Design an enzyme around this catalytic site. Structure first.
Site, PDB file in Angstrom:
ATOM      1  N   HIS A  84       0.808  -1.255   0.000  1.00  0.00           N
ATOM      2  CA  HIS A  84       0.000   0.000   0.000  1.00  0.00           C
ATOM      3  C   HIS A  84       0.825   1.283   0.000  1.00  0.00           C
ATOM      4  CE1 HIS A  84      -4.305  -1.338   0.911  1.00  0.00           C
ATOM      5  NE2 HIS A  84      -3.630  -2.306   0.310  1.00  0.00           N
ATOM      6  N   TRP A 297      -6.896 -16.772   1.860  1.00  0.00           N
ATOM      7  CA  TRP A 297      -6.611 -17.341   0.558  1.00  0.00           C
ATOM      8  C   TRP A 297      -6.061 -18.747   0.661  1.00  0.00           C
ATOM      9  CZ3 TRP A 297      -5.112 -12.417   1.943  1.00  0.00           C
ATOM     10  CH2 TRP A 297      -5.940 -11.398   1.425  1.00  0.00           C
TER      11      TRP A 297
HETATM   12  C1  HEM Z   1      -6.100  -6.755  -7.440  1.00  0.00           C
HETATM   13  C2  HEM Z   1      -5.216  -6.269  -6.568  1.00  0.00           C
HETATM   14  C3  HEM Z   1      -5.484  -6.381  -5.051  1.00  0.00           C
HETATM   15  C4  HEM Z   1      -6.627  -6.233  -4.421  1.00  0.00           C
HETATM   16  C5  HEM Z   1      -7.956  -5.881  -5.100  1.00  0.00           C
HETATM   17  C6  HEM Z   1      -6.377  -6.443  -3.009  1.00  0.00           C
HETATM   18  C7  HEM Z   1      -7.243  -6.377  -1.996  1.00  0.00           C
HETATM   19  C8  HEM Z   1      -6.892  -6.771  -0.749  1.00  0.00           C
HETATM   20  C9  HEM Z   1      -7.790  -6.634   0.364  1.00  0.00           C
HETATM   21  C10 HEM Z   1      -9.202  -6.054   0.319  1.00  0.00           C
HETATM   22  C11 HEM Z   1      -7.192  -7.097   1.437  1.00  0.00           C
HETATM   23  C12 HEM Z   1      -7.807  -7.169   2.845  1.00  0.00           C
HETATM   24  C13 HEM Z   1      -7.482  -6.004   3.741  1.00  0.00           C
HETATM   25  C14 HEM Z   1      -8.156  -6.411   5.038  1.00  0.00           C
HETATM   26  O1  HEM Z   1      -9.384  -6.146   5.195  1.00  0.00           O
HETATM   27  O2  HEM Z   1      -7.438  -7.034   5.886  1.00  0.00           O
HETATM   28  C15 HEM Z   1      -5.888  -7.565   1.049  1.00  0.00           C
HETATM   29  C16 HEM Z   1      -5.044  -8.085   1.980  1.00  0.00           C
HETATM   30  C17 HEM Z   1      -3.777  -8.427   1.766  1.00  0.00           C
HETATM   31  N1  HEM Z   1      -3.128  -8.114   0.600  1.00  0.00           N
HETATM   32 FE1  HEM Z   1      -4.180  -7.607  -1.235  1.00  0.00          FE
HETATM   33  N2  HEM Z   1      -5.071  -6.723  -2.808  1.00  0.00           N
HETATM   34  C18 HEM Z   1      -4.522  -6.676  -4.052  1.00  0.00           C
HETATM   35  C19 HEM Z   1      -3.244  -6.881  -4.312  1.00  0.00           C
HETATM   36  C20 HEM Z   1      -2.335  -7.229  -3.368  1.00  0.00           C
HETATM   37  C21 HEM Z   1      -0.921  -7.172  -3.685  1.00  0.00           C
HETATM   38  C22 HEM Z   1      -0.362  -6.719  -5.065  1.00  0.00           C
HETATM   39  C23 HEM Z   1      -0.268  -7.588  -2.593  1.00  0.00           C
HETATM   40  C24 HEM Z   1       1.244  -7.716  -2.417  1.00  0.00           C
HETATM   41  C25 HEM Z   1       2.036  -8.078  -3.424  1.00  0.00           C
HETATM   42  C26 HEM Z   1      -1.265  -7.902  -1.573  1.00  0.00           C
HETATM   43  C27 HEM Z   1      -0.945  -8.391  -0.333  1.00  0.00           C
HETATM   44  C28 HEM Z   1      -1.846  -8.588   0.657  1.00  0.00           C
HETATM   45  C29 HEM Z   1      -1.628  -9.273   1.892  1.00  0.00           C
HETATM   46  C30 HEM Z   1      -0.368  -9.970   2.398  1.00  0.00           C
HETATM   47  C31 HEM Z   1      -2.910  -9.143   2.666  1.00  0.00           C
HETATM   48  C32 HEM Z   1      -3.144  -9.749   4.061  1.00  0.00           C
HETATM   49  C33 HEM Z   1      -3.291  -8.730   5.204  1.00  0.00           C
HETATM   50  C34 HEM Z   1      -3.056  -9.409   6.552  1.00  0.00           C
HETATM   51  O3  HEM Z   1      -2.452 -10.516   6.594  1.00  0.00           O
HETATM   52  O4  HEM Z   1      -3.451  -8.855   7.621  1.00  0.00           O
HETATM   53  N3  HEM Z   1      -2.552  -7.681  -2.066  1.00  0.00           N
HETATM   54  N4  HEM Z   1      -5.706  -7.349  -0.323  1.00  0.00           N
END
Ligand code: HEM
Ligand code: HEM
Ligand SMILES: OC[C@H]1O[C@H](O)[C@H](O)[C@@H](O)[C@@H]1O
Lengths: 716, 716
Positions: A84, A297
């Site tokens: 982010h 996931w």
């Molecule tokens: C289409 C692109 C993406 C969308 C629409 C998306 C959306 C999200 C959303 C909504 C969350 C949940 C936030 C929450 O409520 O905890 C999330 C979590 C997360 N995202 Fe993505 N994301 C995208 C791409 C990515 C990318 C590019 C990365 C890193 C390379 C990433 C890494 C992560 C990780 C590690 C979490 C887990 C948070 C946790 O463990 O607390 N995401 N993503």
């Protein structure tokens, strides 16, 4: 209602759309607590990386009561955090990005998509505490994410420190919508407004529930493809990035979204700058509510493996709703029931995916990329490594700026690389000699100055791409850019400088050599030394050699597209399709050059009389002197003996007449703003007084030298 | 709709009432075109005053076609100009005034009451042009007015140069009304809102047609009396000022006010920062339209005489209306017909007066003052000279600042004068000796530091009144001020310092002496050197001797009223009747001390632990250590181990507890804002890190020393 300044009131309230010069004084020195001697490069090179890594790897496994750790590991949360921080970047203007740790300040700290990262940033305080001055939050935030990856089994391509912290937020146009998650930014079929790179106000790229809340993967893919493109990611890089990320961790939406308190900047004092305080359950951990979506996931949320893809193709998906009422997919016919671990010891859950995750199987181009990786996970690992690296280093500028023992040697095309110095450098005597040779080349002051400015002024300070180093003025696309005007001379100028390069180089004393790229800048300097004497002033323009000549192979034509000036008040160029009128585009251009208002002002006045203008137009050229360096621009701008009106031929220009009723000068909006705007005019009165001329020349030379050197992190 | 930054958008749009730290970085160095070496005092002392005066006299008699001169003389217009430049001043916060030449920036340049002074300023360009760097517009604008007076036969009391020009407007609360000429500022009978000093938004003092357009002289007088009072003018000074001014010149309202174009900041580029362009007739001179009123007070509009008062009493007045439909008086029964000259050769006119001019004959107190001067015009001349002088010099600060060969020697009460150094000054060895004597005096670190701060921190940077010089801490009213707390010690502290003063002085080596005022400050410095060692740090606090001791006779108690802190976050004081909550009043106070955010921040964190607080309250005091100088405040402010909530006893305070549920710290809004606000917290993290402690001490000392020295223009 007008308010106290301390509460935000000012002149912007009285004249809503006036020119705001505060863009030319962001992050002022006086609000910087470090003091002027502070040199982060020198600080951060003393940092023991290994110890830092281990200090971080302890914070990751040491849960804390006010935001307990999913699966006893904050790593995933940090990966999200770093993604982010870097993921606000956009190619149109090169702003956003991780480079100034802006996620800790408004508005970003309070964007809905950054919900919960307030707590993520807080968890790292103990690391910052320990390292102090030697470590910027900016470096820390993305390094944390890179350490998380390594920690949980993914070996990255490398890392570079250098990101200097700042102390007031970088102010940036994020969109027109005055409401969080609003959309007034599409037109035509689905053309996203320039320069934005997100589908709604407050998001990073796209909506995780699909376009406007509509969970149609096929469509979402169009939004993904295009937003990611506008952050410099092609289809492969984009798919690698999503699967790689979502290999770790989970979302959070364990209860209603209406039980979540206000965002950080609007929260009360007792929360210590933290926001989104949840009265649902404990408000944290088990009862956490970040996005409103409750997906996990993989079944290995704290390890790196191919689970994400195995699960994506390994099941069939149907629409459901999280406990907060948001869209997401879960596996059909109660398949994989209880195969997915709970973040806090609970019983297992069923497989789940975002709408946008399904895009990677449903969209035909993404299907092809991800299927391939379903069977060749090592191609995934490699592509994710490169794209992650690029992601968190895109705004770092030239390689020279990358510090630390974790920076790999290998050259990357996207870095717009330039060669190493391969020979000796010109000393004082050769510089002096070469200036003469240039003065005798038959190239005019106007040509020389134009060409130098053309190349150097391609730098933008947001992502620190562009500049005169590289000598890319003579390559595609810079050479065929309207504003640089190939239909003008340019090619004549290049040829001549190549002839002088070869001559000097064929007869060089021993092993000194000079690059084309240095001569382009040196020419301008000479030309200005010439116009100084023509105005009865004797000065030497400073010049710093070292620039090297890239080649067409080492220049990504497509990526260089976004640096074509669509406007440049310093040459009176004004293309089509700019979002505001010329005087505002001038200021933004000054901003991108890192220029102050004084500096902007001197350069315009100098440039005009030197004949720097687009197509050598007479606009702004308030002098009877030919290629002479005077303050004439200013003196004439303050002549009340002249009366200005729009041109009859209503064309954005103005006619200034004298007592006799005859047109004497012509100018554009960019020219006249200096005599209209009360702040700018103040500056013009300094440089147009009778004692002003030496000072004008000196400051002009300092500002010119500043623009020539903008990308020269190789000597700083 | 959110806007581009360059067009004004920013975070203020998302959270309307957030804390604006931009008040602590106004007029930043980077936007100043003069550079760092620039020293006006050294420039302006080279100015040949005589030539300037003559250069100005020429501009006055040389009419210009784009705004021709009434009676072939711009003097009166310049007087008005100068009076408006000084006449924005207000006693409540000591902002406004001529001291920074703010009339040439927004909003003031575009206030309605400053209509036409855009053209008056422009006429002086030839003067500024000639003098350049050696003359500020600030000095020029009022000096012009002063020269106009002398030129037309009025010998003034003198003049002082020194006003340094600034490059972005000073942002100041002028009232809540979002409309020009609006009124939402009265309550009760007719109590004007604090801190305003004008009856409507965009006026100087009052409405020349009487209260809210109602031409009742008796009432107008109440407004005059009270607005003038709030700009430091008593009844005499006020009547002198009006008659004196209105002895010269005329108003302008020759046609309809709706044929006047927009104000300067909203005018188009071609007008070159001029506004109010009039399509009525030629728009200028004969057809001029400034206020809408068409009065010519005297029959000698370009000479100094007693005509004004001779006409006021010499006739009987009745209501009429100017050609633009505004209220004014003219003389009954066609008396004095044609006795008043036309500004451009036309036929004579009848006598005329403003509603507010009749106030001076109708109000009983004013009637008594002006009748007297009807027969004793030399008393008028004398009063006008003293009051004019005061008017245009009120914000100049200590006498030291006043430059040039036109400054008279005579001391004035309103300048809050201090005595000249009458003896030698303490050298290094006597300073060092006196510190030990103070350390042994039995006064605590808390008392010494409190007292120093109390005196020095009375300085406000707006009008540069107050400060530690004068030693007025021991005199009325400063000694009996709630925040200074006489009920606390203070008197014990004073007594002890007076004893040490006399002891040193009775045994002084030859002719060295030390003032009380220097000891108060020296105390604090010692105390801090003490608390430095108590925290295992060895430093010497710099100290600058020279302060002298005023007396009660030389201290206007009433005028010192406005400097009583009604709040001071630096001592956690918060009185009643402040316009906004504590964190805002903290910032405004820091502004008044000329402090930057880093400076404000170190001071609060130092002052707390030293025991500087009002009634020594525990609020903020985040240390186990007693009168020790540590960063503890910061380190503890960033302890997540603590949980904050409002105090149950709902009293603007907060309780911070640990894992055990026990109150461990208490704090106020002012304390916690440093851990809530994202920018301030960023500073706290610099000074709370583990490597931070030396730097904290160094910067704290530098900032303390900066507050001690604020009023010491006698050594700069
Ligand atoms: C289409 C692109 C993406 C969308 C629409 C998306 C959306 C999200 C959303 C909504 C969350 C949940 C936030 C929450 O409520 O905890 C999330 C979590 C997360 N995202 Fe993505 N994301 C995208 C791409 C990515 C990318 C590019 C990365 C890193 C390379 C990433 C890494 C992560 C990780 C590690 C979490 C887990 C948070 C946790 O463990 O607390 N995401 N993503
Ligand atoms: C009761 C307080 C005052 C009121 C209501 C007032 C009002 C006005 C107004 C409305 C004008 C018309 C401007 C125009 O139409 O050009 C004017 C003119 C003028 N005022 Fe006053 N003023 C006040 C105090 C003063 C003071 C303190 C001075 C300076 C001693 C002053 C000096 C002048 C001069 C010299 C002009 C003539 C300008 C010219 O000839 O263009 N006024 N006054
Ligand atoms: O950076 C590259 C340039 O300078 C080098 O010294 C080479 O001799 C020259 O051939 C080349 O064009």
């Amino acid at each position: 209602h007008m308010k106290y300044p301390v509460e935000g009131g000012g002149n912007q309230d009285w004249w809503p759309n006036r020119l705001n010069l505060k863009v030319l004084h962001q992050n002022p020195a006086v609000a910087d607590p470090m003091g002027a001697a502070f040199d982060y490069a020198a600080e951060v090179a003393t940092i023991d990386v290994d110890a830092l890594t281990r200090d971080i790897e302890e914070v990751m496994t040491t849960s804390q009561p006010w935001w307990p750790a999913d699966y006893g590991h904050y790593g995933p949360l940090f990966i999200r955090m770093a993604w982010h921080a870097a993921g606000t970047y956009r190619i149109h203007d090169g702003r956003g990005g991780a480079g100034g740790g802006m996620q800790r300040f408004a508005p970003l700290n309070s964007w809905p998509s950054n919900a919960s990262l307030d707590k993520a940033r807080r968890l790292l305080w103990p690391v910052k505490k320990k390292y102090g001055k030697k470590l910027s939050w900016a470096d820390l935030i993305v390094f944390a994410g890179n350490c998380a990856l390594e920690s949980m089994g993914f070996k990255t391509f490398g890392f570079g420190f250098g990101r200097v912290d700042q102390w007031e937020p970088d102010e940036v146009y994020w969109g027109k919508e005055a409401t969080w998650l609003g959309d007034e930014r599409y037109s035509g079929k689905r053309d996203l407004e320039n320069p934005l790179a997100a589908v709604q106000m407050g998001l990073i790229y796209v909506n995780p529930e699909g376009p406007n809340g509509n969970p149609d993967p096929m469509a979402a893919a169009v939004d993904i493809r295009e937003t990611f493109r506008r952050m410099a990611m092609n289809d492969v890089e984009t798919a690698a990035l999503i699967v790689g990320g979502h290999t770790f961790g989970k979302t959070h939406g364990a209860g209603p979204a209406d039980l979540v308190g206000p965002e950080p900047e609007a929260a009360p004092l007792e929360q210590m700058g933290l926001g989104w305080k949840s009265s649902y359950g404990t408000g944290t951990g088990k009862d956490a509510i970040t996005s409103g979506i409750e997906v996990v996931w993989t079944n290995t949320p704290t390890k790196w493996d191919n689970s994400f893809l195995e699960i994506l193709y390994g099941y069939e998906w149907e629409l459901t709703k999280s406990p907060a009422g948001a869209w997401q997919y879960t596996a059909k016919d109660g398949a994989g029931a209880g195969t997915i671990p709970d973040p806090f010891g609970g019983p297992g859950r069923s497989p789940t995916m975002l709408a946008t995750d399904l895009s990677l199987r449903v969209d035909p181009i993404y299907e092809r990329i991800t299927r391939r990786w379903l069977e060749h996970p090592e191609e995934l690992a490699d592509e994710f490594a490169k794209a992650w690296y690029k992601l968190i280093h895109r705004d770092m500028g030239p390689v020279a700026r990358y510090l630390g023992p974790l920076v790999p040697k290998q050259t990357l095309l996207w870095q717009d690389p330039v060669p190493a110095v391969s020979h000796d450098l010109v000393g004082e005597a050769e510089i002096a000699s070469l200036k003469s040779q240039i003065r005798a080349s038959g190239l005019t002051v106007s040509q020389l100055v134009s060409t130098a400015w053309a190349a150097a002024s391609s730098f933008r300070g947001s992502d620190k791409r562009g500049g005169a180093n590289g000598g890319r003025i003579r390559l595609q696309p810079q050479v065929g850019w309207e504003v640089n005007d190939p239909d003008g001379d340019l090619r004549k100028v290049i040829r001549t400088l190549e002839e002088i390069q070869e001559s000097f180089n064929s007869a060089a004393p021993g092993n000194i050599k000079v690059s084309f790229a240095d001569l382009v800048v040196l020419g301008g300097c000479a030309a200005i030394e010439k116009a100084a004497k023509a105005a009865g002033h004797n000065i030497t323009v400073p010049f710093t050699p070292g620039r090297t000549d890239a080649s067409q192979e080492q220049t990504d034509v497509e990526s260089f597209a976004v640096l074509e000036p669509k406007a440049d008040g310093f040459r009176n160029y004004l293309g089509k399709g700019n979002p505001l009128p010329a005087e505002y585009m001038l200021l933004d251009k000054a901003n991108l050059l890192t220029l102050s208002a004084p500096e902007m002002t001197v350069l315009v006045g100098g440039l005009r009389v030197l004949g720097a203008n687009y197509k050598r137009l007479p606009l702004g050229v308030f002098t009877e002197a030919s290629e002479s360096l005077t303050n004439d621009f200013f003196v004439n701008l303050l002549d009340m003996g002249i009366t200005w009106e729009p041109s009859p031929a209503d064309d954005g220009t103005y006619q200034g007449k004298d007592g006799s009723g005859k047109v004497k000068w012509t100018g554009s909006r960019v020219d006249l703003v200096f005599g209209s705007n009360s702040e700018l005019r103040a500056l013009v009165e300094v440089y147009g007084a009778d004692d002003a001329q030496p000072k004008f020349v000196q400051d002009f030379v300092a500002a010119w030298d500043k623009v020539m050197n903008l990308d020269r992190f190789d000597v700083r």
